[PDB]
Every structure is written in C-alpha cells, then in structure tokens.
Tab-separated table of C-alpha atoms and ligand atoms in Angstrom:
chain	number	residue	atom	x	y	z
A	1	UNK	CA	17.093	-28.394	38.816
A	2	UNK	CA	15.685	-27.708	42.347
A	3	UNK	CA	14.812	-24.242	43.766
A	4	UNK	CA	17.907	-22.394	45.070
A	5	UNK	CA	19.426	-18.909	45.676
A	6	UNK	CA	21.997	-17.029	43.538
A	7	UNK	CA	25.741	-16.864	44.511
A	8	UNK	CA	25.721	-13.034	44.064
A	9	UNK	CA	23.833	-12.687	47.412
A	10	UNK	CA	24.043	-16.114	49.184
A	11	UNK	CA	22.764	-16.434	52.812
A	12	UNK	CA	23.859	-12.933	53.954
A	13	UNK	CA	23.324	-12.609	57.749
A	14	UNK	CA	21.038	-9.781	59.010
A	15	UNK	CA	23.474	-7.142	60.393
A	16	UNK	CA	20.665	-5.423	62.420
A	17	UNK	CA	19.997	-8.304	64.872
A	18	UNK	CA	23.107	-10.457	63.994
A	19	UNK	CA	20.942	-13.583	64.706
A	20	UNK	CA	20.354	-15.067	61.190
A	21	UNK	CA	19.686	-14.242	57.460
A	22	UNK	CA	16.347	-12.497	56.728
A	23	UNK	CA	13.461	-13.987	54.638
A	24	UNK	CA	12.690	-10.593	52.986
A	25	UNK	CA	14.987	-9.059	50.330
A	26	UNK	CA	15.479	-5.346	49.490
A	27	UNK	CA	16.761	-4.593	45.931
A	28	UNK	CA	17.142	-0.801	46.559
A	29	UNK	CA	20.664	0.686	46.160
A	30	UNK	CA	20.379	1.976	49.792
A	31	UNK	CA	19.940	-1.575	51.205
A	32	UNK	CA	20.661	-4.499	48.773
A	33	UNK	CA	20.428	-6.989	51.707
A	34	UNK	CA	18.017	-9.254	53.679
A	35	UNK	CA	16.095	-8.298	56.866
A	36	UNK	CA	13.855	-10.055	59.433
A	37	UNK	CA	10.208	-8.890	59.953
A	38	UNK	CA	11.136	-6.660	62.955
A	39	UNK	CA	14.487	-5.519	61.443
A	40	UNK	CA	12.755	-4.619	58.148
A	41	UNK	CA	10.157	-2.449	59.927
A	42	UNK	CA	12.982	-0.731	61.894
A	43	UNK	CA	15.137	-0.166	58.747
A	44	UNK	CA	12.402	1.264	56.469
A	45	UNK	CA	10.650	3.398	59.196
A	46	UNK	CA	13.093	6.274	58.482
A	47	UNK	CA	11.933	8.794	55.831
A	48	UNK	CA	13.620	8.460	52.401
A	49	UNK	CA	13.396	4.607	52.443
A	50	UNK	CA	9.552	4.472	52.847
A	51	UNK	CA	9.256	3.639	49.081
A	52	UNK	CA	10.990	0.213	49.615
A	53	UNK	CA	9.082	-3.149	49.526
A	54	UNK	CA	9.923	-6.689	50.866
A	55	UNK	CA	10.657	-9.178	48.057
A	56	UNK	CA	11.177	-12.956	47.910
A	57	UNK	CA	14.700	-14.494	47.854
A	58	UNK	CA	15.661	-15.084	44.171
A	59	UNK	CA	12.864	-16.070	41.689
A	60	UNK	CA	9.756	-17.800	43.145
A	61	UNK	CA	8.858	-18.847	39.542
A	62	UNK	CA	10.939	-19.434	36.349
A	63	UNK	CA	8.289	-17.763	34.103
A	64	UNK	CA	4.839	-16.102	34.449
A	65	UNK	CA	2.457	-13.528	32.859
B	1	ZN	ZN1	15.368	-1.148	51.960
B	2	ZN	ZN1	17.371	-9.345	61.626
C-alpha cells in the first residue's frame, strides 16, 4: 500500500503554537508528540531534554541495513 501514518499517533496538533501538527516526532517518554521547527527548539532548550532528537513521522522505509 501507499505511505501513511499509524493510528496510535495520527495528526496530533502542536499544543505549543496551536497552529498545526508538527513534521518532527519525539519518541521520548517526556514528549511523545510532534513539534514545529521553532516549537521543537523551544521545547528541547530546557536542560534534562537536551538528549532528545527530531525523528520522521512513522517509517520512512519498510526495510534497510
Ligand atoms: Zn522531546
Ligand atoms: Zn508548533
């Protein structure tokens, strides 16, 4: 089938700006939500979350090395 997102996350709206869903995903137990470029920088600036990293939404590839 075609590329698509999982129903366990869906298009969750960015609660920081309240404008739209973010392109970057955070899998950390602290976040577990999407953020925009500016909202992501604001969220992860605080110490204790500086180990986080922006991921793609769902799998960008079914299988790889
Ligand atoms: Zn995070
Ligand atoms: Zn945002």
